Amino acid sequence: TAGDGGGLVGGEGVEGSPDPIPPQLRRAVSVYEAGKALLAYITPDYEEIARVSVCPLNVLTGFTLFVEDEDKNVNAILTRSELEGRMVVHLAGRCAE
Amino acid sequence: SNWWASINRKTGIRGPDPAPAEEHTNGPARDII
Amino acid sequence: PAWRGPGEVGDEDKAVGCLLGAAVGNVLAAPYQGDRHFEVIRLRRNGVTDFWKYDIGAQPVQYGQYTGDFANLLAVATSLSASRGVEPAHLLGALTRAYAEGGSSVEVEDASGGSSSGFLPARRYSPYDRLVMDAVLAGTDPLKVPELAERYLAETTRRHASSSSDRPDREPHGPSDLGAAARAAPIGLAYRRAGGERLLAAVRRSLEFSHPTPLGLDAAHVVAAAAAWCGRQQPGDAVGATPAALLSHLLNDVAVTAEQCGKLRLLRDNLFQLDEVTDWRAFYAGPQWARLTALFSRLSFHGLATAGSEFASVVLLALLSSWGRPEQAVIVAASLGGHAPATAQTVGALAGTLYGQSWVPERWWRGLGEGVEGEAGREAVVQAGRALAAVELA
Amino acid sequence: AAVDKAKVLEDVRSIISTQLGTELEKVAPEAKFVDLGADSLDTVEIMMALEEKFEIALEEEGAEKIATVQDAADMIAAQIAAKGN
Amino acid sequence: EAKAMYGLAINWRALQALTQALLDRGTITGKEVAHILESNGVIHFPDPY
Amino acid sequence: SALIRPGRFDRIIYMPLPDALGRAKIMQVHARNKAVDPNINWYEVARAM
16 A cells, blocks of 8 residues: 555555455455465475464455474575475465365 | 366366355445445 | 295294394484485485485484484393393383493583583484483482473473474374384284283383373384284285284274274275385386375374374384385385384384394395494394293293 | 454353353353253353453343353354444 | 365365354464364375475 | 774674574563563564564
């Protein structure tokens, strides 16, 4: 949100953003985030989940907080298994919806 | 079952449970705000 | 058909072969401790079929040197055959002797003078049984340790949130882990003609000091009963020596707990037999390895079996998948990573106590002789295995 | 407008156990009140303890028909949800 | 995309359970996620490839 | 490059970023003043930072 743009936040009252976030649009975010967290859980060696949230700060998305290990790839390494796992996890939400 | 065998992206992707296509609408104005 | 070799082997070959198979399996799988199967089968594209000479882990293993778990197993075997019966104090002293000697200690640093003088057993030791063996050697009572340890290693505390427990460091060690389930094959070999409840009391006295909870005890009971079954059986009768019979036998009168029998059933109706693999590079990239790995992931969490039920199930999976091929079996058991030393050691032990001695390939015996263990350790373990076929006191 | 029904349920069950004197494992989310030992004059004192703990006011018409623990939890949650407006 | 579809399709029950938990609870921790998923019988992937 | 000659400035000491235990210790002292629920697994909340 920075100008006449906008379109992401969802609780301010003005025309662009509704007040109570319709329930049909909350079921969808729940489905999205459930699919993404389920895929991140059954993938071996992925980062670990600390917290899963739905519409934090009223934004119209989900959010999953991943904690990782800095003593395994010391801010520099990226194997191929990790990259393929990340691709799958990022498409999981679309597929579940 | 094994419905996940007959998933086909040409004829549409769909799950087993029956199409929760429920919805509603007020006017365009009472939905913008 | 299956493996033939000799006819029905005698009674001394069974014991010496069980201990030899345990030793070779442990020293073979030693460097692959704590990683997944895909990492392993991409590190050893030509197959895990001989000893490794360049290990670079945090506690590095040298050529042909075994871990602490096989030290525990061999101490169990000798202390059983020495006191002529499973006695808690005798084997506890033997275990802590084999744990302390040759090691070293380091001091620590803290302002007020905190004495956390760490003991560094020269051989690799699991964390939980390391804590157990240092509490027993610190003077504390040898029988009330489990309740103190299971709540000291409770560093898990709350583990608020923090889901994915991939980190083996996060796996639930303690009185339900594989600590006691690993050193229970020679016992089940000693009492092969004693009766069920005698076996049970023996294995119970074998773990009273570290693994009192029912799960670890049931896993140890399962492995011991399997070893006894093989000791009584013979590798020639195409009727008695079959996976189905052993599985049904073990589930009926040996299985007690719920998830134990659940895992065992799931292994029972899903079990298949591998063909004779001569090319490992094509096996690892084949449908059969894929099916095996699917089943293995179902019998565990992300490919790391730390509970007693998980341990027993994966051991018998690796063992029954290649009925009639003990060498292929121990290779497959080591190729799965995770807790590779313990698993490969118990698979080798059971394979030896069933088929005997004529299967261990020459190169493994050679490497055992040429390692740091040398002829000293080789003849030591073969003599400790020899002094095992005639013990029946009380 | 969004209530953590899980927290509300745990707190309801703890309050009920402390009021009646039975232990928390016996209080099940579908347990009626009549079998837990509750007699009219105490399906009221339980309501008062609930309000006193949560600091809310119960809608009376619906409060006439409270007979299982899950209805208590759902009443309290529908009250907490409709607080701003 | 095919792997994601397959992994979600074989875990339908656990997916619906987790969806309902998120819908009624709002926020979840990782340990509750693990609990909900394991009490509904998930089927892990063998490898990430 | 003038001050880096001997006698003037001939020693440099590098102070690195903390680790898990270091961060845990850091936040265990920022709690000695404020009010904090005592039984906080400081190590785990430090692992995620």
